[PDB]
Ligand SMILES: Cc1nc2ccc(-n3ncnc3[C@@H]3O[C@H](CO)[C@H](O)[C@H](n4cc(-c5cc(F)c(F)c(F)c5)nn4)[C@H]3O)cc2s1
């Protein structure tokens with residue numbers, strides 16, 4: 569039983585083969601969800617499911633450095649349903665993040681910020697209840 | 707061994723199976739392919755491409771009912787034209803894991819879940835093969 573927003577510390581930074589697993593439930597009339605892998609006030613990887621952008625559901629990914637966003641990467645596969653439980657797994661590899669939801673591959677996001685040791689927090693927020701958040705090696 | 711080569715997987719694939727392949731990339735290689743086959747379906751296709759829009763990339767996918775799915779792509783590219791390599795593929799309960807020259811390269815979650823039905827590993831494209839075997843670890 570965790571609270572939201574939740575900043576999961578990643579004390580040593582991220583490394584290849586780290587698998588982060590987040591379990592929770594989408595709030596019944598959710599509008600947005602966010603996972604932010606942060607390096608200080610910069611966001612190495614922002615993963616943002618939007619339940620209604622111009623009447624579509626879309627996940628937007630991007631990077632924030634010095635208070636500026638970059639080029640968005642967008643994906644319409646949308647495995648989240650309002651009110652329903654979900655398992656998100658983020659696998660960190662040497663060149664990208666890979667995300668799977670409910671054990672199914674969703675997307676990949678190539679590293680823009682290359683200093684993986686400095687990514688030391690994962691911010692989890694938006695319209696969810698959070699049951700658990702941890703990581704392991706695979 | 708001669709390429710293309712089909713490595714039989716007599717009891718299919720199962721967690722803890724390790725496959726080890728040694729060969730050499732041809733100096734003018736364009737593509738390499740490892741295909742875990744179940745009939746016409748390919749549970750996991752591993753496809754290093756040496757020149758796709760002037761980049762090297764590895765493309766992974768699954769073919770089921772004659773249709774490919776969503777690709778997983780890797781820019782980490784451990785193969786060099788002309789050079790020997792070692793590929794190991796470990797089957798785990800949740801995914802295949804692939805290491806090249808003893809370094810982790812990628813993982814690929816299972817999409818086709820009936821692993822015991824995978825009967826052959828096809829090895830082809832721009833390589834020469836010194837050996838290919840499987841063991842349980
Ligand atoms: C170079 C660029 N200039 C712009 C200008 C505008 C935008 N627009 N237009 C709509 N929304 C955006 C922005 O897109 C970003 C992704 O590219 C972030 O998602 C950004 N954003 C969302 C959130 C957020 C905060 C929360 F508390 C949440 F719970 C939550 F779920 C999301 N914080 N920042 C969002 O405002 C994008 C860009 S890229």
Ligand SMILES: Cc1nc2ccc(-n3ncnc3[C@@H]3O[C@H](CO)[C@H](O)[C@H](n4cc(-c5cc(F)c(F)c(F)c5)nn4)[C@H]3O)cc2s1
Nearest residue numbers: 737738739751753765766767773774775776777830831832
């Ligand atoms: C839903 C989809 N619609 C498309 C449309 C086009 C493609 N494009 N566009 C370029 N190449 C592709 C295809 O990507 C596939 C993986 O997603 C396979 O690699 C597919 N392919 C390569 C090979 C192959 C055969 C050989 F004998 C080799 F030696 C060898 F090294 C590779 N067999 N099949 C390839 O043609 C992909 C997709 S997925």
